[PDB]
Amino acid sequence: KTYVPKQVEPRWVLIDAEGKTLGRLATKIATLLRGKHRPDWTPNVAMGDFVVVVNADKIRVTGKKLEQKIYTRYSGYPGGLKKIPLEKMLATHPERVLEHAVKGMLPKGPLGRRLFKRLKVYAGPDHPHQAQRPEKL
Amino acid sequence: MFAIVKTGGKQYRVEPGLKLRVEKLDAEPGATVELPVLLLGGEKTVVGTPVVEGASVVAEVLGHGRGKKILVSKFKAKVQYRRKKGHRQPYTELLIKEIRG
Amino acid sequence: AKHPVPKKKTSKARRDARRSHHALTPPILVPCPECKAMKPPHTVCPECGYYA
Amino acid sequence: MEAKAIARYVRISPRKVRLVVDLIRGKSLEEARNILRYTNKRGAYFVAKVLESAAANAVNNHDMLEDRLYVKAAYVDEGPALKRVLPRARGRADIIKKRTSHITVILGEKHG
Amino acid sequence: PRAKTGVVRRRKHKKILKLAKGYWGLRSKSRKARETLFAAGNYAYAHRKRRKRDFRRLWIVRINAACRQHGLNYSTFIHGLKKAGIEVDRKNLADLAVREPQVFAELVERAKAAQG
RNA sequence: UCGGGGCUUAAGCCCAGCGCCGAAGCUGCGGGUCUGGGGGAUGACCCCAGGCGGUAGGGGAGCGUUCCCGAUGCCGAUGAAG
RNA sequence: GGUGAAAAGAACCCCGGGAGGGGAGUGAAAUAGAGCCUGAAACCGUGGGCUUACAAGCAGUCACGGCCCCGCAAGGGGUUGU
Ligand SMILES: [Mg+2]
Ligand SMILES: [Mg+2]
Ligand SMILES: [Mg+2]
Ligand SMILES: [Mg+2]
Ligand SMILES: [Mg+2]
Ligand SMILES: [Mg+2]
Ligand SMILES: [Mg+2]
Ligand SMILES: [Mg+2]
Ligand SMILES: [Mg+2]
Ligand SMILES: [Mg+2]
Ligand SMILES: [Mg+2]
Ligand SMILES: [Mg+2]
Ligand SMILES: [Mg+2]
Ligand SMILES: [Mg+2]
Ligand SMILES: [Mg+2]
Ligand SMILES: [Mg+2]
Ligand SMILES: [Mg+2]
Ligand SMILES: [Mg+2]
Ligand SMILES: [Mg+2]
Ligand SMILES: [Mg+2]
Ligand SMILES: [Mg+2]
Ligand SMILES: [Mg+2]
Ligand SMILES: [Mg+2]
Ligand SMILES: [Mg+2]
Ligand SMILES: [Mg+2]
Ligand SMILES: [Mg+2]
Ligand SMILES: [Mg+2]
Ligand SMILES: [Mg+2]
């Protein structure tokens, strides 16, 4: 009968965003979020690392995105459309562009969201240093 | 010490002395089949070719038997078709004796 | 018997749930100066009477 | 040791007494009497009465000590309803279930 | 001779109410019961066929997640092993990886080598 | 809104290639049943091969309910039916 | 339509205006107590176990896990978090 993990301490990580293609970056951050580089993987469980990102504001993005790419945010009401172009995003709270794109590669359940909570993002660095932080790439 | 024997369609990690059930066998009520099928070991037996050559594992047919019945039942809608079936799968029981590859 | 009507029998659950705010709270009683008796505050209550 | 008392076939509706009974579940008898007393509901005058007798037997029947008995458990059960017709407008006629209860309290000596 | 229903149907009913035990609200009291059981049947038979692909999957992820530590694809790791001639890793038992990793790590160079 | 996230010497398009994933398909191991072949003089049971999605519908074998023969019997208060 | 073999139909005390109960008593049995044999289901309730207030649902199923329970264990039962 297949092995099954017991409780474990959560590994943390640190990433530098500068120069990273936003998506290509998200992908990994995602695959980390699910305990999915670990070989004792377990779906129903949430033993993902605790990815911490810094220098978000610097995220490279190809093509015309900045100008061209629009962020839809539907309020509840008549004409709650709300389109926000990629720049205005970074220009004001920019952590989002990254957040707003890991949430995206995370699966959908309560677990997915448990995970979105492990991920912690700042444009900085200067994240609350605490302990772990093993930088990556 | 580790050893991966392949009995009855499927393969199992196997220890010096442990009970394990497997796809039914033709063996006596209580005799000794050696699972001439073996792969790996507690210290890298390592099965270069499919099977490991000068190797094997002894086991005792503890006693055949059959399992908790399952209800395989089928139903297509709009169409008056229901089929209920009983199906307990048979399973012979093993005490692993000699790990001796 | 007419125009608007319940579309489905409400369930034991849904029913009992609506009922959740139904429970009553016990009276408010206080002992009187006079007897060891129990009164709703600011009342008078028989078998005890009152002064002034 | 328990002291049971049941008054059955009372002509109040279950859903409606249950409320009062709920008021005194697991309360000190001296406590209940006070609650049942100043509760605003036709419901009490029955649960009272049945509670009061619950005590009586507790005492003139099981030596149990008044000053130390409490409503261990109590409940009410639906007994058979009295169906009545009710001529209703435009000829159609309705039937009214005048429902009915079996109220039950049971006392216990507190502790030791 | 008249054969009234009698016991018969009561009994056939109970039979099912049993199976239907623990189902939500009304589905454990009737013939909503049956309707439910009906689907349950199909669901399991269908899920018993799934439970296969279910693990196949879980296993792979587990391996691929492993031999990526030794830097490579399940897609090639598995490849070597075919070349390697080793039927050994029935994906089930590449839960080596989890315990007794040595044998895996060994199994790695083994196909690495097998590669070229 | 391209299923979405997201993608730009790509995660797009064209050309060539090696891998792996991937169904209830095919294999492996076990088991049903039926049809055929064989053992067996035989019945018996055993082995080998193959068929076994299905509405209208045709065919087969069964299960249970009431009653009758079996009952001037048998079970039944040490407990019938339900 | 049906207490029980027999009315032996529950004296008497207790709470209550009564009803109805609690004791006492009869009976093999009184959840056989009087529209009383048996007493199923829907339906209402009381107590206990597991569970639930960031969560998306034909209500199940497959898996793992936690808790509770039966067994010395291997095991099983209940519940349901993902
Ligand atoms: Mg359908
Ligand atoms: Mg309820
Ligand atoms: Mg009117
Ligand atoms: Mg009229
Ligand atoms: Mg009929
Ligand atoms: Mg459940
Ligand atoms: Mg096949
Ligand atoms: Mg086969
Ligand atoms: Mg046979
Ligand atoms: Mg066949
Ligand atoms: Mg076919
Ligand atoms: Mg067919
Ligand atoms: Mg066909
Ligand atoms: Mg008859
Ligand atoms: Mg008995
Ligand atoms: Mg009389
Ligand atoms: Mg009496
Ligand atoms: Mg006297
Ligand atoms: Mg009067
Ligand atoms: Mg009378
Ligand atoms: Mg009897
Ligand atoms: Mg009884
Ligand atoms: Mg009466
Ligand atoms: Mg009556
Ligand atoms: Mg009943
Ligand atoms: Mg319990
Ligand atoms: Mg919660
Ligand atoms: Mg339990």
Side-chain angles (χ1 to χ4, degrees):
Chain A
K1 282 204 169 194
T2 289
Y3 167 73
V4 199
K6 301 204 173 178
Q7 291 279 8
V8 173
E9 197 64 353
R11 178 213 199 171
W12 296 56
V13 194
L14 194 6
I15 339 231
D16 193 57
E18 99 152 4
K20 317 294 181 182
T21 320
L22 154 113
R24 312 258 186 190
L25 171 54
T27 266
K28 244 292 175 190
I29 310 197
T31 290
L32 276 26
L33 260 347
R34 340 190 57 196
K36 213 179 164 232
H37 45 257
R38 291 183 38 175
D40 63 342
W41 163 238
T42 300
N44 46 106
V45 76
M47 17 86 139
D49 302 347
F50 256 65
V51 164
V52 178
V53 176
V54 289
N55 282 183
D57 36 25
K58 291 191 179 176
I59 343 177
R60 283 282 84 110
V61 65
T62 107
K64 314 196 195 206
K65 310 290 172 60
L66 289 91
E67 313 163 326
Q68 164 234 56
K69 159 140 163 175
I70 308 131
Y71 277 8
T72 327
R73 162 175 286 269
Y74 171 65
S75 75
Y77 292 68
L81 24 75
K82 227 121 181 197
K83 319 208 199 186
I84 291 315
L86 203 213
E87 316 153 354
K88 242 256 278 175
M89 262 286 78
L90 292 176
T92 144
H93 27 59
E95 41 282 17
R96 247 116 97 147
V97 287
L98 214 279
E99 316 192 46
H100 213 288
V102 255
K103 188 149 177 164
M105 334 247 166
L106 284 182
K108 330 94 160 196
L111 194 85
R113 6 222 197 67
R114 203 162 178 264
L115 307 185
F116 179 105
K117 285 210 294 178
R118 308 304 208 42
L119 158 317
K120 262 67 189 269
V121 162
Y122 323 69
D126 306 89
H127 83 260
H129 327 266
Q130 151 222 267
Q132 299 287 23
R133 168 190 174 260
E135 191 181 3
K136 240 324 284 180
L137 49 136
Chain B
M1 316 306 98
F2 258 115
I4 303 315
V5 37
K6 184 187 107 169
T7 176
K10 340 173 312 173
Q11 316 166 185
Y12 318 60
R13 99 71 183 60
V14 169
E15 305 275 338
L18 93 309
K19 301 124 171 187
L20 118 159
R21 308 120 94 83
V22 168
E23 229 53 75
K24 164 184 166 200
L25 282 145
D26 297 328
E28 286 187 334
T32 306
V33 277
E34 179 190 57
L35 293 304
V37 270
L38 207 160
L39 300 336
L40 307 205
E43 265 72 32
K44 291 72 163 309
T45 293
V46 304
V47 207
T49 45
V51 188
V52 56
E53 300 121 68
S56 33
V57 33
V58 159
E60 188 164 25
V61 297
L62 218 28
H64 320 70
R66 51 136 289 189
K68 192 191 235 174
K69 175 154 58 182
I70 297 179
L71 301 144
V72 271
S73 61
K74 308 174 113 179
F75 168 111
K76 301 191 189 172
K78 106 175 178 44
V79 99
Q80 24 81 185
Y81 172 103
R82 290 86 182 271
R83 297 276 196 282
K84 155 172 190 155
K85 169 176 181 174
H87 170 95
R88 34 101 139 191
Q89 177 91 10
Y91 79 123
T92 72
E93 209 167 13
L94 290 193
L95 204 183
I96 288 315
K97 287 284 184 177
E98 230 83 295
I99 74 294
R100 78 172 184 213
Chain C
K2 255 114 168 282
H3 260 152
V5 131
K7 183 116 173 110
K8 271 295 156 72
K9 173 183 215 166
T10 115
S11 62
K12 316 211 179 180
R14 209 172 259 281
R15 161 177 44 108
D16 289 342
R18 162 208 316 140
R19 298 257 184 79
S20 86
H21 308 81
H22 275 280
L24 358 61
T25 61
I28 292 327
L29 295 174
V30 304
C32 49
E34 302 144 328
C35 181
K36 188 174 185 65
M38 285 296 213
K39 297 192 182 185
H42 308 277
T43 51
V44 174
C45 164
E47 198 71 39
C48 210
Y50 207 54
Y51 59 51
Chain D
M1 150 134 278
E2 76 185 21
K4 206 218 287 199
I6 311 149
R8 32 165 37 211
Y9 298 84
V10 216
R11 241 260 73 213
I12 184 187
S13 166
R15 182 131 150 286
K16 277 131 92 98
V17 265
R18 292 184 189 301
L19 277 332
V20 185
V21 173
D22 283 312
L23 237 10
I24 72 190
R25 210 183 257 79
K27 259 46 192 158
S28 131
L29 168 95
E30 201 208 16
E31 201 174 353
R33 296 136 162 294
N34 273 145
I35 306 179
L36 281 233
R37 159 97 87 119
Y38 286 105
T39 259
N40 200 13
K41 288 281 188 188
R42 179 153 165 304
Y45 163 99
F46 307 149
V47 214
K49 198 159 276 228
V50 70
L51 182 254
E52 214 61 343
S53 129
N57 313 143
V59 153
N60 316 17
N61 247 135
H62 302 90
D63 80 37
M64 305 176 55
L65 286 184
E66 187 174 58
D67 312 323
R68 57 175 190 173
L69 38 59
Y70 77 118
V71 180
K72 183 164 163 273
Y75 54 49
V76 22
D77 282 320
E78 173 117 54
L82 277 60
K83 318 222 195 78
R84 311 323 224 193
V85 304
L86 157 45
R88 203 84 184 283
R90 265 208 217 97
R92 52 182 117 270
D94 288 331
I95 81 171
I96 266 190
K97 281 189 157 227
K98 262 150 150 179
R99 302 188 182 260
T100 236
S101 306
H102 298 162
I103 310 177
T104 282
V105 231
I106 58 196
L107 287 356
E109 317 220 62
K110 197 53 183 164
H111 51 244
Chain E
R2 164 204 201 224
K4 179 208 322 195
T5 317
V7 265
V8 178
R9 181 208 292 133
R10 188 223 329 286
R11 285 184 180 163
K12 275 175 173 176
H13 274 37
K14 284 252 249 176
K15 188 168 180 184
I16 286 187
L17 268 353
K18 313 189 187 306
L19 296 335
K21 274 317 165 185
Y23 288 158
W24 168 289
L26 223 158
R27 307 187 175 242
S28 58
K29 334 270 176 62
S30 46
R31 84 166 171 157
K32 293 266 80 69
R34 182 189 280 180
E35 289 178 15
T36 291
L37 283 185
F38 266 154
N42 289 17
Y43 277 14
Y45 169 113
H47 290 352
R48 292 199 266 87
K49 291 234 181 164
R50 253 221 193 282
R51 199 165 42 201
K52 278 68 174 183
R53 357 207 187 107
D54 261 320
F55 285 105
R56 296 167 173 181
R57 182 152 320 197
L58 182 271
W59 297 340
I60 291 341
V61 184
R62 299 254 258 214
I63 304 133
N64 204 32
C67 51
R68 215 152 267 256
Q69 295 168 330
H70 304 209
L72 73 147
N73 328 308
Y74 151 105
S75 86
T76 39
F77 172 137
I78 261 46
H79 184 15
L81 278 70
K82 219 50 69 184
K83 280 305 183 189
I86 60 160
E87 165 176 0
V88 48
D89 218 10
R90 56 97 104 302
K91 287 94 175 174
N92 187 4
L93 298 155
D95 95 287
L96 289 184
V98 205
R99 355 141 165 176
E100 316 307 81
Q102 290 61 35
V103 188
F104 184 70
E106 237 266 29
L107 268 152
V108 180
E109 330 290 14
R110 258 308 212 302
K112 290 246 226 183
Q115 262 297 42

